[PDB]
């Protein structure tokens, strides 16, 4: 079923709750985990490799399986889940923006309907 | 981590996938798998019990895990995970009403929001 | 600007809110008013066309401008809205089936999605 | 009804349709009308006194009814409808960060979703 699980992760406490789902779901299934983190349009690109790094850190997926994306991260997000393959998409209900507001967070409602693969949300 | 998952059935293709989706989930994680099918404010009945009985057939859950509720859809899942204490929610994106003009059904809206665990949406 | 107004009533407190600023629109913009009530798939026309009754009662429309459609409300509304070539459709946040737990109705969110013209949100 | 209107500003093309839809919504209600743009988390200072410039240029207001805000966009609007007392506030459905994906922006789903007041979406 899921052969390849693809993890969205903003460095936020649901992604680190996400990544604990993602790396579980990866042990259950026997399948390949891939991590991402955009960012978005240096100091950015710093900032932005340490949350990568973190999320490796919880997942211990190999380097060639943590990737830096930039874009808005949904469609950074799409675009890898369609060249991985992703099976699954795992990440928040809501991230670093949460207001409490929204029902979902934005960049969650974009994979969700724009998804080529089922999604798991992490609250 | 997943102990206990819960399926929204509603008959509707997106729910049949998510039905596969969710045994599957079920047998890797070696977890509960119960199922449930709302019926809305007899015939009615008599409907939804074929519905459920359908839910029954594509997952293989014993006769005390597939269960009939009534209401507002997401307020019966909603009750029914609570009570169950289900760690995962597996429902579709869309269902019956499906028109393609909503970015989520607005059963799966209601339970991304409320969810006392995570939500694994089905396309 | 807005000529014609098209007014959407369930007959909910938020639509008999949204039928006091649509009333109040179509004086300021010297606009033609139009009201429609949707019933779903008779004792169901009966208690629909009671529920057309009082959004012309609180709006002072004539007849032929207060209607009643059948179909998935918000496909009905649009339909009614490309014909009438409203300028403007008003319609509330929520309806009857509020639970509080949605950003906004579904019926609300399809019609908006697809508008042929702005939406006023009545809360 | 409508005596004081505010209009949520971004520079996108939905927004310049929704300042000509606040400006001709003031001129029919008698209304005094805001207009307000946000900027986020100098550059950025004068790329947003220019945005706000050109909404002042399109509805006429004087400049104590223009308004620079910092911060999250709806946030920063939630915060000017309430204290100018705001009676409609008119944004649009998208803006600059539109992909098409969205069933309406982060920051109007954010406004709808905590409104003091109507909200006029215009596409
Ligand atoms: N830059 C990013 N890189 C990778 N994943 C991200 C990124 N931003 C968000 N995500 C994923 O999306 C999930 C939901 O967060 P999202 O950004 O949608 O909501 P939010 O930050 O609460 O609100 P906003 O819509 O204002 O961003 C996060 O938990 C994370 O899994
Ligand atoms: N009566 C129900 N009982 C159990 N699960 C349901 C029921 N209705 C919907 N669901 C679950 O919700 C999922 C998404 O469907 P939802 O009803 O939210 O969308 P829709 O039918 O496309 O639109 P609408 O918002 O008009 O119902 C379905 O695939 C199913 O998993
Ligand atoms: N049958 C209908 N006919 C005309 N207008 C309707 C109808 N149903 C809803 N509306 C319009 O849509 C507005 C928002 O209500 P909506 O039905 O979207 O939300 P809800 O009833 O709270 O939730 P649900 O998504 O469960 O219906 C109502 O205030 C009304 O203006
Ligand atoms: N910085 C801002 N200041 C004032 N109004 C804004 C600002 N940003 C957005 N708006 C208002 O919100 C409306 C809808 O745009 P919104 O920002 O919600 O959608 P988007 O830019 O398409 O997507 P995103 O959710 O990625 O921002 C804009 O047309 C404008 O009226
Ligand atoms: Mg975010
Ligand atoms: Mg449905
Ligand atoms: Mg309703
Ligand atoms: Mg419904
Ligand atoms: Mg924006
Ligand atoms: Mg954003």
Known sequence: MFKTILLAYDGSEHA???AEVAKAEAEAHGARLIV???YEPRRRLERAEG???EARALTG???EDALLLEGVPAEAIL???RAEKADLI???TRGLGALGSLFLGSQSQRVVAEAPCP???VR
């Open 119 to 121: 999604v798991l949300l």
């Open 61 to 63: 997926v190999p380097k």
């Open 16 to 18: 680190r709750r996400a």
């Open 79 to 81: 675009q890898a889940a």
């Open 51 to 53: 949350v990568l790094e």
């Open 90 to 92: 795992v990440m928040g």
């Open 36 to 38: 991402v983190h955009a």
